[model samples]
Target chain A: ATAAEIAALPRQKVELVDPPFVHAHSQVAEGGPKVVEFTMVIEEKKIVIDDAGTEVHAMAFNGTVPGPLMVVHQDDYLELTLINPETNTLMHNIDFHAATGALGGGGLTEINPGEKTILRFKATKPGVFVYHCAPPGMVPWHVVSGMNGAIMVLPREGLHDGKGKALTYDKIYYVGEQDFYVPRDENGKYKKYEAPGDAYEDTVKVMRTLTPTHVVFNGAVGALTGDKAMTAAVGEKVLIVHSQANRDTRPNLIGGHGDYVWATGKFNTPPDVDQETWFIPGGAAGAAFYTFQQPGIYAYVNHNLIEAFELGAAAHFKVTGEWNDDLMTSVLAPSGTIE
Target chain B: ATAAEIAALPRQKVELVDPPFVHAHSQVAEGGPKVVEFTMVIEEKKIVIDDAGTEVHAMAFNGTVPGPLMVVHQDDYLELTLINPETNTLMHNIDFHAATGALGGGGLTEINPGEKTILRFKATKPGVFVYHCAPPGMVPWHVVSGMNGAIMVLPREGLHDGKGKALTYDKIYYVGEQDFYVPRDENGKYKKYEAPGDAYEDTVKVMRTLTPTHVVFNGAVGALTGDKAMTAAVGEKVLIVHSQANRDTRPNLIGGHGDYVWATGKFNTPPDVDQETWFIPGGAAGAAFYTFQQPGIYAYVNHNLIEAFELGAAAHFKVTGEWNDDLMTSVLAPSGTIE
Candidate 1:
């Protein structure tokens, strides 16, 4: 087809497949040389919040705050199926930062309520990228409403250093940062709405404030802390991919260092070493690798303390292992030691 | 010493070091492995602004806006000593995005007025990164008050292309973008404070607005234009490192392309090709390389027109060299006679 002719075509079509939620130990698709398919159903959901002891109306993909993490290898073709159910009140589409053309597949895949659209694009870059809803006049609204997620394009032969030495991770964790602007009533209570349009004007007012009411990990406050904290064992390497769709973020691992970090998410270069906190741009994603050492609770936070402590942009890691005396050993018993 | 026995070392200690501010077209340290030392003294200064004739009491580093730019090479040990002089009213510290450990050095370096502290770390990464004050409960306030600067770590062999070819620049410019929120008192006049402590509450209120009263380059409006515009020959290669301490910025060269852009500022990776505008995250820095192609008034700005035009985050490039008509020429001339 001619260049312009291809541009005139409708959205690409694909056969969607439903995969399980991508986890820390998830492996790359085996027996490749074919397209990897994924399916998502966009819906307006009222998610119950345990921290706030209430619920929030949010637009989600696959029924989760950050939708779902998608993983693929470089050169693989990604076939995505998007369904906007009739119950939704607005149109929606997917824009993959990992995809190369046609507005990151957004122009071709817009779907009205009750409609479905499919898009196929080659994953040519090796990096972690963001995918979010990008409807006309509602980009930020849709993204802040929780219609964003991350896609990982692994290097075909896996990650490597500048000298081509191989680098591997035993596990992976996807931490999606989202800042929500929940409108409040005159009485200082969160305003509630039944549909997207019903909350547009009110929600926009809060968004304009640019002072997020909630900055959470995954979905709501405490979603990644307390009993829901992530787990790991000492001496195991872990890759953490953090994505922020509509706001910038700084991810800091309290008791660990980023042994290797792709702060901009692109993997075409060598990763920086030993970063305590890395900046993640809005609409972009970043990845960090670290090996567990001491056995203790590790808090991963936005580094913006107010957001981490007050607005809830924090997560926890419960690491278990034997302590090493050589790295750290006390010479004195505190005269007034309590522990 | 048992594992629990040595956990009580008061703290790690190292000899403090102090060097000078980094400048453009500076040379890398020459000898074998050695430490590059730096020192900064935090001070409270009232900057008399020419923007509509006003003055803003600002907290700064070494009594200047945007502090001072520091340059080093990859693998260099950077030993920095931070001094919070007696005249200052609040606690101060430094956070180097390019450094590792202890809150990017902020944790160990925080000091009270009339005190000084020193911290050292290895510069293992090659990139242009932002360094700012990150005291608990006052990060945004400190940053917007002009307590931020930039540090650049050049690769040992200098910059290279994707194919490993060496790249060089004739001159370099560090442009720091800052947004100031000078509060207004009743009757809608600009509020003036006597000290840093006095401005806290009022400044905090204006900061929450997220609408800055002045978006400037370096210290104030027109600080980088007219008499202060950066100069270069038309054929010289210029590397510009743009840093935004606490806000998002879109930098554009009004009449030129970012011949190469490290969009996220890490130099270990290859830069993007021919970008007209590049994104810089708050608390982060990005670098762009360009060889001047023409000689005229080239305005560099935050592409967000409202900020660039109204708030004043703009700079000018004064290029003095012969213009080549071959690169750009008019096809027809205005004729007096009718055809």
Candidate 2:
């Protein structure tokens, strides 16, 4: 079908949210098939990836480090309007791993500053996949500098476990892994740029060194920790969608197991059950279907400990609900540390 | 059984080989579960990780960057005499991901200079796993250095395809990924030390930065490329066993796919088929089973493009065979830029 023909089809608009918060969508097909319309504006800006205020010149989507997670049912079309504002300094494009052809919609939608392109492609694959900027010259830099996100294509029958049992989640969270290579000044501080891509020289030099100065989730250190943690009630199941645009990462829950993990993110294959830790391929994404078993703060981290604690690739889950509810007993006052 | 009783069991000795090569071992049991005895001596040494000569103080298992890949069957005991030579200044021990208790044998076998400990434990896991030094305070520093290797525990029934058909390999090659962070001096040169750990203060500072100066196959740049490339004839199935002791990695064959990938490295789970790329979780290992069909140098890379090409995490395979020998057709001389 031609582009205009597909554009004239049915459309369903989804308001994208920030990191760790997934936009609500139907678990199964809704009104047959509709084009999922999602919008993200290109902003040549800055993101402080370090908790210590270490900033990097990042090309972002919708002002957030990672754009947002857009969800659609299988066979539905993903229609995105990528806007590169005139206020921005560089050109941009979107490459969806979930879409098919033409550099995964990149070549079809390369828009320069002040320009915009509406691209649509059928989500042929059923899985969670990574999406990132794909214009030439500095694709890696663009991706590592926060111009990446993820999308999920659910199966027509929703999710199922290895034994073909139904798998449903009470919540959905998207964690985008961002690795930044920031140039340091002589004073031993990360240098800030007046404009995006201005740090190209020093950044590319560090990029050539293949060493990232910071690795974070949702754009910054502690972005999903402390008060910003994702929440779940006791016994709530969450489907965590993780995407790593430029580097391979391992995702592990501190006090949980992947009840079912589509490690490669494909639904055609049955998931491995009860994974202690799961691997997320560098350019692709993976899915972890887990249920919160207890009430506390559980850390979700890149299994690489150094990167998790020292380099900022960590997130938090504030699970609420009392334990030992199988048999109701007298409630007692909690006592620990400060209390 | 007591230590003395386990020590009296029958033992089989195997000499470990360097990276990109696996020491020969029986595909199945020899005499029904003998203790697979291995040896490694801790050496405080200096390794030049860059082709242009960047040096780092490494605490190595044996003398190689990554000690060796050991293979055994499930339920077999792995006995190792980890020696801390009198010439060494630092203490050392081994933590096998395949072994059971005592901090994976690290706690039971801490040896000082001039001392050695013979530790044995049953291979309770059936998969490829990482083993590294564990001497407390600087475990990450020690691991990021050369003190790591891998072992594989095969199932008693031998390898099999997802359909349960017996899957066998004509050859087995072990690829170990080592990421190094060597400190540089004022003149922009990698500082050389008179002895290992002398560069401790500088190295730890760089380590804390969480950026590696070099990510290499085996020990150094060009370690498994060009003339050092591994060899296999066309139509030969090679089991590529990969381990990353401290970092998560993705393994991909440039011109091929993983016919069967135990991405999590656990054999109990059914493997993924025809994976274009597979992720290996950090602190663990994975297995990729593929058969060469075309005659060319297949580049096995970490899939993280920068790390694979620029930071030295790549290995080459020389497959020598004709494109068509079916029904005895013909062969031609290769023509290229060099040849």
Candidate 3:
């Protein structure tokens, strides 16, 4: 369709996937075990992200907001295909920096809506690398608009633990994007100014200030609490893959105090040891998780402290089992503390 | 004149003010000896700012971008005014939190193009205050646009020293708003989208990383070096009034390692024995200074340490007067056993 024709269409028929959505570790798609197929339709969600001042567009790969954390083994061959619907005007492509064929993922194609592109690449190297839509220079904008995520590739040896639960759940948590709302003008009014192309692009600025209007724990604020609480047994290694969506906000997890800041940001060879919080600059990315050896009410928050108060970016960990105070403070305290 | 008529008119006759905008430490004008006149035009003087970024705004009070530091005694009447012919809608006001006046200088009418406004108020408290545009709800916008500054009101007893220099100020410095600028798209361009009376507020997203694009030392970056440096003679007490603008970028200044942090983002306090650097948070509003007892190149910068990398906030104090090496070495040899 011509540019003018596309612009003139009044009531275009297109699917909408709202933001502040959630994704689980387990994919229930009908796809084979070798692959987890998550599908999402990019449409403006009905919910208005507080402080963010706009309704979120639930854009996802296949169909999920964060697609899914597909775990592949190193030295393994993986293939994926993406089919864009006939709605999106902008071309969509995926770049998996973690894949050996990341450069050949058809990431260069501006596959327009209704176009089909195949992305097949081998998992090379190690560590967690992010994969996202990069048709050109959408680096910060696309991701900030919820169009990016990490794909974790396990060592050929798979998870270090040989348990049936895939990786031992000493503690496993997911920390991703958390965009929020900005306050209404003192006039107590909500103004939504439609951008020339996309209205969601301006919403990323909400993360710059504390007291974010909308608070997303992972991908979406308040995602893992109340009805959406993530579960892991007490004394288990609850790994938290904490990632901040665009903006320089630090996460300070104080819930029952998770020991071992694990790997800060990315595993650029573990962390430098004594890190109380993980600082993710805007645009750039990192991943870190800690195990909760003890069982209790543990709350994780952004170390910026003030942001946690205003922006309301936070989470909780409920470990149920046995309580060992001596162990918690002593040598073997499942407190998740280790050098 | 009606807004439409004013907009349609041709440019008005104007003049620019060159720097070293002179203002007597003590003067009298239309009011008592309280009339402190800063003689400089609005746009003539160059605004030399620091930190990281290209193409910065040229702002000032009177002639200087930061206007002028109006110093007064507590309860003393203040008569501050600015004269300029710049046709741009440059609204100037003073928000003296430490004085009894209209909240944020709302009482003083905006000094429009080819216009001037004289604001009168009594310095009620003994703390430092900021005098900037007092337009209805456009404070931050005005400040970011270069209409902001610092003012100090001496205590009831006035600033005095028992023996040294006859007045306080091992050091006196001014810290006002220091904001960052980044190119939105790959083009690295800044579009001035803000106009008067428009609800269209520009949302300046603090960079994704804490890396400051520009760190201006006293308004313009690197303006206080070489021939035009803000210097302190030997044995003179220097006062540094420091503040941080924008969201959360604080300046942590650390030199080659010497001195102590006397005071932080605060005013009206004696030097804190020995302070090498002061870590001031963003949005900090206060006064702090140090005495230049020891002569050397003392670097003044944000305490964040890392910020001083390239565009990090920092300054050089080329103390030219006395030199005491033996006493200095014996006193600051590091702590422990002194090798």
Candidate 4:
């Protein structure tokens, strides 16, 4: 069969969801081979990144800052339809860290405004991997301006402990970390631009400075805090998929541990146990699993403390259950005391 | 025994050498538990950081930019007689990531200029870890200005694959990645300081910007390149210990792969096999092992390309051996091609 005949082979179209949640899919596939499909649209719009209304004219996918999470099993074909609407001014392409071939399919799929393309490749590796925009010279700008997301290529039989035991999660959360550089004028107010390319020169200036103005999770500061927090119940195993497309990040759970973590996200490799923190390499994604043994509000943060607290790289998890005092205790009330 | 009597117990003192080379020590120690002792001196001096002669009034240990690497066996008590000579301008202290204590012994070892102290702690963790100065009011400044090094705590039975086979090395190289934030004046000239804390306010300003002006391995540009390249022979197992005390970094070996890498440097955790790159969290260290398979110069670099090439986070490995065509071959020399 020709290449077109192979891609045209019947596949299941899977609709993806926004951040913090994944689409419905099976961790373990039934016997037969399959092809999973998705369609993502390119959107160029301005996004507010912090409480103070700091903005970046971002180029994103599917109208969301970090695109969407993609899930497929190893040996399955991942078919993606990429659309660049006429509203966009610049060309766009994708580089999947999980995909093979030169430039990860970016070369064959560059789409100008009003253009669209379809690319498919076999999911040969099993792990969580990052995928992002890489349109030649403007790779970093696009990625930092919210053009990145992740895909989980699972083993056909699903996740497993290196000891050959099955590992399962009650829920999974997607955490996308973005380090944004917004251009500022001489007076230091962030400059507003009429279009995406209008801010290019000034944004590149800030990019050369290399000091990100804001670093946030899933699009903005407080995006995962307060009422927007991720949730879990006691005794539930929660998997967190963390990705940073343009800069390194160390994810840590407050008042908890990564009960089992694939720090590099390679499921074939053994996961480290009881880690206080795990690292996600830039241009890559990593996953950590923690079972909620107690109920409390937990902050998931990039362990680079300055980025976590000062620059908005934090997310909150609200777990519900009766507190387990043996796990932790408030032994004494706050009061004045002398040593 | 009393605290004084315990500290006075007999031990062997090992002298440490400068960066890229470790002191003489055994990966597997003899049966009896031992006390390993060393003396580290705090020195404040002007360091030329790059080829352009940019200067930083650096606070270092034993006068070298990244101090020196220390080696010990797990369960050994690491005894240090730390000296802060009268010539220094500011107080200094040591924090060990591998030790168990409050602030990793930082709280117990703050030494004012003109004072000396002895601190002892057990090497309870079998891993590679970072140590650095964490004086009050200037932790980041002191660390980024060159007060970080690493220690290796090998298990009593020594290095091994998870499969129970011994994994040995012919040589080990210490890579201390320093992200220097030198204060630059309005005219863009790198500022000069009369003493250690003179540039504190300005350096803090640059630190708040979160962009390092220079990111170099061991000390400066070209410090690990050209004539200073790390040397290895084909079939020799090379262990690279990388540390970043103040900021995160990803270490990648170009034209090579990490045959075995403890990405977080935890010996107890199973190492990831055959990785193109590995991550080291800030404030921690990681290790990778690879055997030279062919003869050539291999670039060991922080994979953050801008930092590796532009700001100097690169090292070189000049491997000597006959080229083996089976592993890699010149399939085709550069030539014009027609579609």
lDDT of 3 at B179: 55
Give per-residue CA lDDT, model 4, range A233-256, as digits (tens): 999998999988767888999989
Off by over 4 Å in 3: A1-47, A50-54, A62-64, A87-89, A100-106, A137-141, A158-171, A180-188, A192-215, A256-258, A262-268, A283-285, A322-339, B1-339
What are the clashing pairs of model 1? A329-B6, A329-B7, A330-B5, A330-B6, A330-B7, A331-B5, A331-B6
Candidate 3: true interface contacts recovered: 0.00
Could you give candidate 1's per-residue lDDT for residues B1-339 as a string of tens digits?
333432332222232221112354234435443456666677888895546766787778877788777877776666676777776778887777776444556655777877776565667678887788878667778888888888888887788766787678888888888888888778887877777778888877676555788889878888888978888899899888888877778999998889888876877657887999998756578889999989988999999999999888889988999988999987788878777
Query: What is the C-alpha lDDT profile of model 4 across B257-280, one tens digit per residue?
Result: 677889889999888874545777
Scored by CA lDDT, what does every candidate get? 0.76, 0.80, 0.46, 0.83
When just chain B is superposed on the true chain B, each candidate scores a TM-score of: 0.89, 0.92, 0.68, 0.96
Considering every candidate listed, which one attains the maximal TM-score? 1
Q: DockQ, per-model, please? A: 0.07, 0.08, 0.01, 0.07
Local error of candidate 2 at residue B195 (angstroms): 8.0
- In terms of DockQ, the best-performing candidate is 2
lDDT tens digits, residue span B1-339, model 3: 233432343322223222223223431112322322233334532243543334444445564556556666554545444554655555554454443222324443455556555444444445454455444344455555455565666664545431232344444555454654433445665433333333123333333222346666556666655565556776675555654433344433333322323222222333344444443333224444455556666666665556554663566667777776765666665678758
Candidate 3 chain B, run of 10 with poorest lDDT: B27-36
iRMS per model, in Å, is 7.5, 13.6, 25.4, 9.2
Estimate how well candidate 3 is docked, as a DockQ score: 0.01
Clash pairs, model 4 backbone:
none
Report residue B88 deviation for candidate 4 (angstroms).
Answer: 6.9
